[PDB]
Amino acid sequence: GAAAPSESIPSVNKAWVYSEYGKTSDVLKFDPSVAVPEIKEDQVLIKVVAASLNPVDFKRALGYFKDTDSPLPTIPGYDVAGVVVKVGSQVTKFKVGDEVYGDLNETALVNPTRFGSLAEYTAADERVLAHKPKNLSFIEAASLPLAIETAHEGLERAELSAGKSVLVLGGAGGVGTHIIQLAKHVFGASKVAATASTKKLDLLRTLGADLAIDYTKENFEDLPEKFDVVYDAVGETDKAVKAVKEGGKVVTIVGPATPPAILFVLTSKGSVLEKLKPYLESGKVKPVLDPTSPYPFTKVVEAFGYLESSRATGKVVVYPI
């Protein structure tokens, strides 16, 4: 990892861009010659190999957090995996040639970068990145950060620990899939319960759920069993609070939260991915990709449309970029 030759890094590249807020089918345009971002001294420049989509990407593009967004135009995409091509002068953890992955935006809703992952090259803070596990493809790696870190942070906020029970609302979703795997394999839960629709229950069990509850047939909050931790990933805290043991904790990522539930927004941290590395390397915790992934870089509008349709059953990843 000595520096790349200077003129080997381009100053323009291909990216997807929107210049006004709206629906992705209306505003998202391919630009063959966008500026490659200059890095700050605590950043690296990455040759992007794969990027994954998230709901935040299209909600941001609709203007949902314009108050605290970065200036338009925007190149979307939070999740990335790729190869380091340049390091800033304060970077100590990465060298040129390192294969890396992460969620670009430390504070998801406050000044996310103008230059996201749906581009050939992007700038990333050292602190958001981790070394890619050798046994994961770039597609697989790209699929992970936002969802696995959100699962981890919520479980830590809820104080999950060995021997405790957990109920996950929305187990088949992108975050919920990892809540289940982390609860069972990383946090040592004695019992993991989760809700989903009828066709998704075998997925819940495959991932680690001891009890898969069909929300189309029964109401979890009416069960006599109550849980040490309830992690709401759908926006049902008014019911979630009825399923927790006295003295337990309820956390949600979809507000407004009914007290005593709390809402949080992920802080993206490469350190979390590093802490999870051995579970990813042993396959105890697995990526969950949509069968339609990957989408080629030419097909980013279609990728968004599929994510937005709610028909996705796993992560929507864009590759090759």
Side-chain angles (χ1 to χ4, degrees):
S6 186
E7 307 200 0
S8 68
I9 300 164
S11 60
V12 302
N13 76 160
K14 303 152 177 186
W16 286 89
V17 183
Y18 58 98
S19 302
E20 64 185 313
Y21 294 120
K23 306 179 185 173
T24 54
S25 64
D26 293 325
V27 300
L28 198 60
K29 309 296 183 183
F30 179 74
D31 188 334
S33 198
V34 169
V36 170
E38 293 291 331
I39 61 168
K40 294 181 168 195
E41 281 342 277
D42 59 355
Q43 294 183 327
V44 298
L45 194 75
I46 295 163
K47 174 77 196 69
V48 174
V49 178
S52 99
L53 311 188
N54 289 280
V56 63
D57 291 307
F58 64 79
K59 293 176 175 151
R60 181 183 178 202
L62 283 165
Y64 287 2
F65 50 105
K66 64 182 218 211
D67 188 53
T68 57
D69 203 357
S70 53
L72 293 169
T74 304
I75 298 168
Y78 282 51
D79 279 333
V80 70
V83 183
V84 176
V85 301
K86 190 183 169 164
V87 304
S89 65
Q90 292 167 26
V91 172
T92 59
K93 293 172 180 193
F94 300 103
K95 67 186 182 303
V96 173
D98 280 353
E99 301 185 337
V100 297
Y101 75 132
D103 168 352
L104 290 171
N105 299 307
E106 185 176 58
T107 61
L109 309 182
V110 177
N111 204 35
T113 188
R114 300 188 63 231
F115 289 95
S117 61
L118 291 165
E120 299 181 89
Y121 292 85
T122 186
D125 294 346
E126 177 184 63
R127 198 183 189 189
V128 304
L129 297 173
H131 300 277
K132 185 176 80 47
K134 282 189 173 179
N135 57 302
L136 294 182
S137 68
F138 282 100
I139 290 165
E140 287 172 317
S143 80
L144 293 171
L146 187 154
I148 201 170
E149 294 180 28
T150 299
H152 188 269
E153 179 169 346
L155 290 176
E156 292 211 318
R157 283 176 174 270
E159 299 172 10
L160 187 66
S161 63
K164 293 174 181 178
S165 63
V166 55
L167 172 62
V168 183
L169 308 181
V175 174
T177 60
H178 291 316
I179 305 170
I180 291 166
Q181 298 190 89
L182 293 185
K184 205 67 164 137
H185 298 109
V186 176
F187 288 83
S190 57
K191 184 165 189 177
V192 178
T195 68
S197 75
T198 308
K199 297 193 169 170
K200 291 176 180 192
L201 306 173
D202 277 339
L203 172 65
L204 301 195
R205 290 179 203 111
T206 298
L207 295 171
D210 304 289
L211 176 57
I213 298 168
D214 190 341
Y215 69 71
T216 75
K217 300 199 185 156
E218 62 186 348
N219 303 309
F220 70 83
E221 72 273 18
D222 290 341
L223 301 171
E225 177 175 28
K226 309 297 166 181
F227 295 83
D228 294 308
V229 172
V230 185
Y231 192 157
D232 169 42
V234 295
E236 279 181 334
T237 51
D238 55 357
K239 292 158 190 192
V241 299
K242 294 175 181 200
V244 67
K245 293 169 58 187
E246 183 166 359
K249 287 189 153 47
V250 186
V251 296
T252 188
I253 55 178
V254 179
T258 294
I262 68 97
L263 166 67
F264 75 100
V265 178
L266 173 65
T267 300
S268 173
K269 298 180 176 165
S271 65
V272 169
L273 300 171
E274 292 298 351
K275 168 190 158 172
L276 296 168
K277 199 184 198 190
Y279 303 97
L280 300 168
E281 298 166 315
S282 65
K284 286 189 186 322
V285 176
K286 302 193 141 70
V288 185
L289 305 169
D290 197 78
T292 66
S293 293
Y295 292 69
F297 198 49
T298 52
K299 296 294 187 178
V300 163
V301 174
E302 291 83 354
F304 271 104
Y306 186 76
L307 181 64
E308 293 160 8
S309 74
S310 301
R311 268 198 308 280
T313 55
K315 285 296 304 195
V316 175
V317 184
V318 176
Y319 171 88
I321 293 177

